[PDB]
Amino acid sequence: STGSATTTPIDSLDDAYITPVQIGTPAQTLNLDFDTGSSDLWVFSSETTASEVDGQTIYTPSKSTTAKLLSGATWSISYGDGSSSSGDVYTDTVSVGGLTVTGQAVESAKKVSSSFTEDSTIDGLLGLAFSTLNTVSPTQQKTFFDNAKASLDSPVFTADLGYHAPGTYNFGFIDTTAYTGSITYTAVSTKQGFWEWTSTGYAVGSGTFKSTSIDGIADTGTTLLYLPATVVSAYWAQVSGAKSSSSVGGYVFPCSATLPSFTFGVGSARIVIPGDYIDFGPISTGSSSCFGGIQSSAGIGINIFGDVALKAAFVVFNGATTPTLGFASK
Template sequence: MKFLSCIAAFAFVDLSVAQKVVKHNFDILRGSSFEKAQKYQTPQFVKRDDDEYEFFINNMETYYQMNISVGTPGQDMAVLLDTGSSDLWLYDSAAKYCSKLATSTSSVATASTDLLYGATPSDFINPKFDNCGGIGGFDSDKSSTFHRNKTEFLIKYGDNTTAEGYWGRDLVTIGDTKISNLTFAVAAFTNSTPVFGIGLPGAETTFGEYFIASENYTYENLPAKMATEGLINTPAYSLFLNDVDEDVGSVLFGGVDHSKYSGNLTTVKVVDWDGGLQVTVSEIDIQKGDKVAAFAQGKYLALLDSGTTLTYLPNELYETFQEFTNATWDDNIEQYYYDCDEIADTTISFDFTGAKIEVPLKSFTFKQFGKCVSGIQRYDYDDVTYFILGDNFLRNAYVVYDLENLEISLAQAKYNGGKEDVEEITKKGVPSAVKAKYYSDTYIIGEHDVTDATSLLYHSATPVVSATTTSSNSKATGTASSSSASSSSKGSASSNSLSSSLLVSVFGLLSMLSFA
């Protein structure tokens, strides 16, 4: 999903031992647009004419840019790596509309690569832009190996950016790695950044609501195609975003690097809902010094999304989180902020049915005007209650996405881990990973109730927020195959989405007063 925010230029790295593993390092860049992003940038406020300040996510976005070559002879392209969507699409070199984000339609609440289904071509926004901003447009007429399949391509993301064009197949080269006949789209009308989605087949737009049910299909996207071509054993990859001050991260297709994490690599189930890479969050704790209290307990859906810069909480939790972490509202910038010194010893602990990741509260902030502004935002689409855990969460975790077995393995990220220790991932799963203690106790679509939600008490802290969730007629089909087995497409504004109500415990609130 492209909750847009940082660029990364991928460089092919040859592994010293011949393995079925393909590694790419990428530069992490930030900027006001894909083509203007640079290293070492941070989110910024923009001054209005009335001397007040506004904050827009799209004014300082983070991109993980993958440099690829497409066609024969090769044409150089730059695309945004995204675990939250599943399609590769490029600019058409003949596009009338191209390049920059539609900032007039984006906002803090909607800067996202979360896919929106149910839109029609008439909903698409086609502002006039420059000539692809130097990112590169694909000229299919100049490639001798391109095959057009005459199927229309339509996609709309959660930040109202869109793309429209046609589908085809061609040779795609990433570093020295060649993938023949890879399916991708060419967009003639767009106000978005080209995206290289590497998620589940069920999130592909060919399986979305733009197609009638009888015509829906999935295809082999990059991870699946790499497995079919024998470049990797199974459609799986590891993502390491590195520390916030670093400018290089890595993605490892088909492998895991044990030097990039500490503790156990713990495996959890992917929640099979609408084709997305969601997992179950069972508890969130807030720790200040030696004091711990449970902020949220139950079963919540959480999307792990490298295409999203910040972290988003559902409405019901957003205000409570800011209150419990002693955030202060600033009317000028219309954001919550902290005294930077006061949050130095505060940590947020996320429990994914037994896999735990700790994130310093400072990682969820960025400095501006001497303040630590909150990087936790509100996710306020109707009827959508899941978390979106973006880059400011993911940089604290080492994450392995096993698309074959519908599993995700997590561990605490280790920066400066020394010499690489790379091992192949096989169809049996991720090497050295252990199953989470409550591996099977996941969010179940249509069967979730308050008893289940409040029964997962992993430690003795007094619960502050419990979850009561209901569901109606949600789709739950999926695929654990690298081929084109069916799975339901992911929609952040679907009529099938979950609804939730949150109960605040008075006793839990009182227990938090000792934090102040």
């Protein structure tokens, strides 16, 4: 089997991407944020505290003939930005882009933090990291990909995120029309539960490539590119007036700037992030200070190749017995 679904930016900045997902019988379609940095499929629901729902579409298990309470199971998760959610668990039929999994754990939110409530465009998350990170207790649950894997034509999914445009998540096949040149594959460590890999270096603009190992995660659920302070300083030093602002919470730059590109290495291959991808617009409405899309990972504890980086590439998440990651230009 295969599946193919379009993923769409939630706003004009590409702060996140939503993908329609069918849950239950008859189908209830929710728009979920596919997150290769976590491993829970959770949804706003009929169980979510009413004051914490503001415009999201909810899953109502009582209206699904295939929903079953997973008795005794609870979940609770926190994200890198300090947001969180928790609740109980149902199993139900879940389809993405024509690919169907029966008996998928659908984690129903009883509580969500304010940042979720305040974003009416995201109805939940669909985790695509390794199932070892799944938070369901006392019986850990598998991700949608893990459940689908054996049925797929090939044990892969691909992320093809757009810059200020829709893109595609495919399951079970590699669309050879969706990228240019060849795909370069690189080793993955699953030791921390992530799609963790090592970039071979970077360049700023038209500058020379610096060969240096940068361990990090391929994370569709993080907006920005978070890299070591040395790397980030070298990038922003090429932008007149750019500075790190503790009050704003990262590097800002004059909105009048033209940003340089940023290149990262994948083995001997190179992925170029155009400068415009690194512009996250005014820090507040009407400001002439703009927020940078490359930020320091210092104090996160891990480097994160988030959407800023991934949207510059066609990315293969190869879930074979020994997982790997592939990157191609597009």
